[PDB]
Design a protein around this ligand. Structure first.
Ligand code: FAD
Ligand code: FAD
Ligand code: FAD
Lengths: 553, 555, 555
């Protein structure tokens, strides 16, 4: 509780010590860790909460003065009123496995990272008839999966998981994360949420604003402990202004609870793989997809994975090639052959009773048969190490950590995400792939990515892997991402999600009518948090105390 | 114009004229009607909606009243009018079409406001994109309009609509209200992406991927913001980057909406409407229970509906065609009406979509499922008389605008509807309790219960169709009592209301008072941030800006 | 007057009339024209400049539009008008003569502003001092005016002017814009000392040694500030003591300039104009390289110029006199035009000044220097046909106003110019790259490249002469695209623009965004300090005072 590496802006060593003393008294020093020593990157099992584990900037560039971990909601309210008093900026995390996007690191160096999930980790409710659950920030996907297994529940309810099962359900959902079942759109499938505002008051959204009737057993409970109205997590909208969205990808409050819809057991499942021989086959693949996914033949969020993405799960670059320079079109085709895979590979799944799956499979099979050399497999038709057998788990909400392995492609693996949005049009996908690829090869990187598919849009997750001891390769990775953002905005593709180092540049792409969108958000931001306390800079939304000349990247 | 019926608060007749002078000089005289006489406050009809007051008046006819009507030509005029309203601190009340009958019509909350008719002159279908399966509309594009525009382009073989019970509504307007359709695309609000707004400060704003600008190119140069094209992804993906602000402008007074992107369902390549009659009054409980898993599993694809017998019977006749009885029809009489029309006491309407192998399976499932109920009969449109409700809902559940549902408003003489719209769990017990509360209060007030459960995913909108004689000033007072009581009864049992009439907005938002009205105090902070002068629709959804006395204006 | 075409922001028609009433009562009716009809927005000519809108309109003709024209008699009226504009918060847009065609003409940035015609009635040459070699002028003193005044006093044997390409411009006006002449005294702004200004607060101010007051004496008593004489050193030495503030009032909206002191070159005692033809398109690279050291060494005394063949050819004829071709002339055709007129593809115009022993040496140097190029031919005015451009520039490079250059605006039917004016290093490679960017975009838009490098000391102003048919609404949109693209291309290669049209002011200042628009945020702080009410020319050079929404008004 004395001397930290960095402090937040305009702030005296007296004040920090005075602040963190009061905190160390509120939550006990078990739950306080001041950052005093010259900050290790940590693992997925025990993630760092100090700085960016997959640093593309300098390692120390995003740096927490401390880490606080409240026991409950009250302590959050207390910490905030203290933050307000000292004009001490916060940075909420749920779990802090948001690697690829900066992890648990704050934008403003000197901030407290508020580890919400360390203690607040209860699966508050799983509800079978409403087909929902209510979770705190500390509930991971494996955790929630576990809860279902210990109560014999996957007979009745399945999850939706991102590629790894370690993320926060709460946390992923407010970043508008994505999965790969029919409930892949995580933000969409929320209903009812609790929030500590910058002023310390508790606000519950949607039908959660309708209080549960007064009665003997719940009488005298604190707000944070009060139960929800019956409809709270069944109907997202409530009455009047639908505000829920003000707390997604924002710095408008601290989220303490949330309802998530769970898809009930289909009563029949079957994943599949479709390999696409040629690199050119993508255009035609996306054109066939468009009306299949619009039609609800492709019921889940399906995904077109580049060859190197599959290859990188199975081994590192070394295990394929000894070369420094990026792999050629010829060498990729060999790997395709070495694995019994296409230059692109379409993973997907069927849901519901046998006769329905029969009709959609028939059509998907003949639909795709339009492409020369196409082939079809189920899990059983593939090698026991094959990716399909992993994604077979993913696409029914069984968590896996197998997908982590492609980070190791290069030694000292870090990922960085460039994630623009395209039309579900072969022409658009290809013109975007070609922009991405051009810049990757200029930057000396192997192109790795997916095109994942929503209803009418395609998230093109580009998977930038780099050696983080290699200071040259970072410098040009930084160039790659800054160039690709400016490029894709020059063909009308925006990014839906990013890393801390780019939130300013990306928000500047969204500058229709002289940055009208951002100007409106600032007004909202400064309205609800006068003292600029909560996560300044998040999504490039700066409160009025942060001058845009010192602080915009 | 010189001498209006009411003025808005804190404002002199000299100022109204200076204000309307400067406005007739912007929009033109054609586009301004000033309500200067009791000739102008006439209820009119659905085909010609009054734009001055509540046509379906539960309060005094003239309680909610406009000083004047102003039909902006285009978005610039709105920017201009907002700027002027700010200068004169003149409250505005935006509408798109103004058929929000049952929830106040076109009337403003604050008497003396300008009803800003957004759809008189902003009524173009700006875009229909087939490969994206979406359209872009300005405020005045009705359902029948958008529908016609599809027929005029031989597009229905590719794209279908989603319609509410009546085809005259604004696509734009209903969406922001979160109205309810009856195909898969029924949640009209969900099915939006990218929308344009004039703020209280006059600035133009586009949400989602609208904020990403369509790249410069020669043919788009020198265009006024409102007339610029959109990005590739504006209407393909609603979130964009950063805070998702779209919800701030649904059921709110934070902006004036100029354009919206709406998704359209593609033509399913096969369709089959159907009706399942549920014999006894009590068959509702078992029915909901059967409906729950099939909706959750997506065996029920559309937004199906469970229609109380009087709803269907009111479509086919007014009350005096059935009883010539003053009091509300007995249980014993409700059955004879049902036997007379070959209907159940509850009636379940629904549609199957897709290729016929798939539809057949889903029908096998639904039919076997419902067969658990004693007496159940199934029908396709084909199997019922021409006048039947199913042939209307056959059209409704594949996006075709109709107007047949109007008839039920004439249940009583001088008939007007009012909707009390509480939400419920998809649970027989919960559905039945709510119904029991509702029905008991309807008897207590001397009204025939009429209503419908529209089944969302995890959730039912129980629409309660209050039909009253609007010349009967004793019935109004009972209706008001009925509404104010039911809000409290249903709040006392944990059911919220998703949508209301102007007169009940403040009471309804008073039920959302978890943690000492925390949700309202937050919306108030936001409102005052973005509309310092309280120009836009003060009192919409209980949200009063700081100039309005909560003591004086709440109800 | 009662009903103008546009009004300024946030302002009622009642206020405009109260404001113009009080003004007709100050200046007089003769000095106020109110733009109340579409008869008044006529482009007119160079000899009679419209003072209401952009005569050379790339936007809609009426995008930039005045509410009214006001011709103050004298400095008091300005103090009065400023005071009143402040009271009514009425934006003003000062002009001296209003021939800023190619950069917006006399139009204001904010539609509805008062164009304040400073040179109608303040047009005296206040002083010509021979021993100091300087003059003092009010706003309305054109070049031809000042020139005539020298002939009327048999002064040319002692003092010469410096003129831009056209003699109708304001000496005052061009200087504050930093226009460019073509003798040694070409940097018109450099060549100023001591200037008088009315501030936004009404107070009168004199810069440099103007702030040192001319000592009291009997014949100067009781004079109104504006009519007081100046100090000995006011116009001999520009700095004075303390902060040098003169730059705050060039290309800015910080003041209204009432008087300026300008230095005049003495008669050199010998002069010789000349033209050097550079045969091939590519001879530009070698040429610049030769020009660099000779300019730096002062072997090239004046501001010489490198004129693209079409510039000279456009002076001699419109496009239909050469091709009757829609598309832009090919490289192969540009050569035949050059052979037809005994000219190079580039053409270098220049002058030698001083006593003949000195001129001869400098010509020996220049001639030998340029001889490095294959094909080079030299000429004196004498050696060319009467119609030639050199006889015009012979007059231009010794201060004589002409109007022959006007012809090139008629290259196309309904022709209007627009200047894109990026800066470059005096380096062949850099000159050539910039030219390659510019030319490529001109082809991409379907325009003939026409342009000129005017060589400063270390620096070249590459003036790009965009001629377009102003009735062709497809070409305007291409021109706009051309301009907005080129700003970005040239910013992407480190070239800034020194001067622009109203429509491109905000984009251009957006390139000056080093350190998160630090230079603009500073100028904004200053602006708001000195003009709290945002009265003076809001939006000049991208500088918006705090009342204007940057969201709404930027382009
Ligand atoms: C490395 C990697 C990452 C990854 C992935 C595959 C690999 C190999 N696949 C992903 C996928 O398929 N889908 C997806 O959405 N993300 C994927 N990622 C990224 C990441 O693993 C996941 O998104 C992960 O679930 C996110 O991490 P976590 O859940 O730990 O999130 P967080 O750091 O706690 O939160 C991120 C930010 O959100 C704001 N935040 C979080 N909690 C709160 C609360 N309670 N209140 C207010 N704001 C909150 C903060 O801005 C925080 O930094
Ligand atoms: C009488 C009746 C009504 C009815 C119905 C059946 C009958 C017999 N069935 C309905 C149904 O199945 N589903 C449904 O959603 N509504 C149903 N109704 C009610 C009504 O007919 C419809 O909701 C109708 O579409 C709404 O009317 P309209 O489309 O005319 O909308 P509005 O009255 O113009 O707008 C209502 C409110 O919306 C806000 N608003 C509208 N436009 C704007 C803009 N541009 N900017 C800002 N706000 C806007 C205002 O709050 C306005 O008061
Ligand atoms: C069409 C054309 C234009 C042209 C040219 C050749 C042709 C064919 N060659 C030029 C050249 O060689 N050098 C040059 O500098 N300019 C050339 N031009 C452009 C134009 O003709 C001249 O620049 C001309 O002298 C400018 O017109 P004018 O002298 O009329 O100036 P203005 O329009 O009245 O003023 C322009 C702006 O200046 C500010 N201003 C002017 N007076 C005041 C006062 N008193 N106070 C405050 N500000 C003032 C305003 O910003 C005004 O908008």
């Amino acid at each position: 509780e004395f001397r930290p590496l960095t402090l937040p802006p305009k702030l005296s060593l007296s004040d920090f010590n005075e602040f963190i003393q009061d905190i160390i008294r509120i939550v006990g020093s078990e739950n306080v860790e001041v950052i005093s020593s010259k900050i290790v990157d940590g693992s997925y099992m025990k993630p760092t909460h100090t700085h960016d584990p997959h640093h593309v900037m300098d390692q120390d560039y995003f740096l927490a003065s401390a880490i606080v971990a409240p026991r409950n909601v009250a302590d959050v309210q207390s910490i905030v009123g203290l933050a307000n008093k000292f004009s001490f900026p916060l940075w909420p995390i749920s779990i802090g496995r948001n690697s690829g996007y900066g992890g648990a690191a704050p934008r403003v160096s000197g901030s407290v990272v508020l580890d919400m999930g360390k203690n607040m980790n209860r699966v508050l409710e799983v509800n079978v008839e409403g087909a929902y659950c209510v979770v705190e920030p500390g509930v991971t996907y494996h955790d929630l999966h576990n809860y279902l297994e210990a109560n014999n529940l996957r007979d009745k309810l399945w999850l939706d998981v991102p590629d790894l099962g370690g993320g926060s359900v709460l946390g992923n959902a407010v970043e508008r994360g994505v999965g790969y079942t029919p409930y892949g759109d995580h933000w969409m499938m929320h209903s009812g949420m609790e929030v500590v505002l910058a002023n310390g008051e508790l606000l519950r959204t949607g039908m959660g604003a309708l209080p549960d009737p007064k009665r003997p057993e719940t009488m005298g409970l604190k707000p944070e402990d009060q139960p929800w109205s019956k409809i709270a997590h069944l109907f997202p909208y409530g009455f009047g202004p639908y505000i829920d969205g003000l707390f997604s990808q924002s710095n408008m409050g601290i989220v303490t609870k949330i309802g998530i819809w769970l898809m009930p057991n289909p009563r029949g499942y079957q994943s599949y793989l479709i390999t696409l021989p040629k690199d050119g086959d993508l255009k035609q693949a996306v054109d066939i997809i468009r009306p299949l996914r619009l039609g609800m033949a492709l019921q889940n969020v399906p995904t077109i994975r580049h060859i190197l993405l599959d290859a990188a799960v199975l081994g590192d670059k070394r295990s394929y090639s000894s070369r420094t320079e990026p792999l050629s079109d010829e060498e990729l085709d060999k790997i395709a052959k070495q694995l019994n895979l296409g230059r692109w590979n379409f993973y997907g799944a069927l849901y519901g009773p046998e006769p329905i799956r029969r009709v959609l499979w028939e059509t998907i099979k003949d639909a795709f048969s339009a492409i020369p050399g196409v082939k079809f497999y189920f899990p059983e038709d593939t090698p026991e190490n094959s990716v399909l057998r992993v994604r077979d788990k993913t696409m029914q909400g069984i968590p896996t950590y197998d997908e982590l392995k492609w980070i190791d492609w290069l030694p000292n693996g870090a990922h960085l995400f460039f994630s623009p949005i395209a039309k579900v049009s072969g022409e658009d996908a290809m013109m975007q792939y070609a922009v991405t690829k051009k810049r990757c090869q200029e930057a000396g990187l192997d192109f790795i990515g997916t095109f994942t598919v929503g209803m009418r849009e395609m998230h093109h997750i580009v998977c930038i892997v780099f050696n983080k001891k290699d200071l040259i390769q970072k410098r040009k990775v930084q160039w790659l991402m800054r160039t690709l953002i400016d490029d894709c905005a020059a063909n009308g593709w925006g990014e839906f999600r990013t890393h801390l180092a780019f939130m300013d540049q990306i928000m500047e792409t969204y500058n229709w009518n002289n940055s009208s969108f951002l100007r409106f958000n600032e007004v909202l931001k400064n309205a609800v948090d006068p003292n600029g306390i909560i996560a300044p800079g998040k999504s490039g939304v700066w409160p009025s105390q942060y001058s845009h000349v010192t602080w915009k990247l």
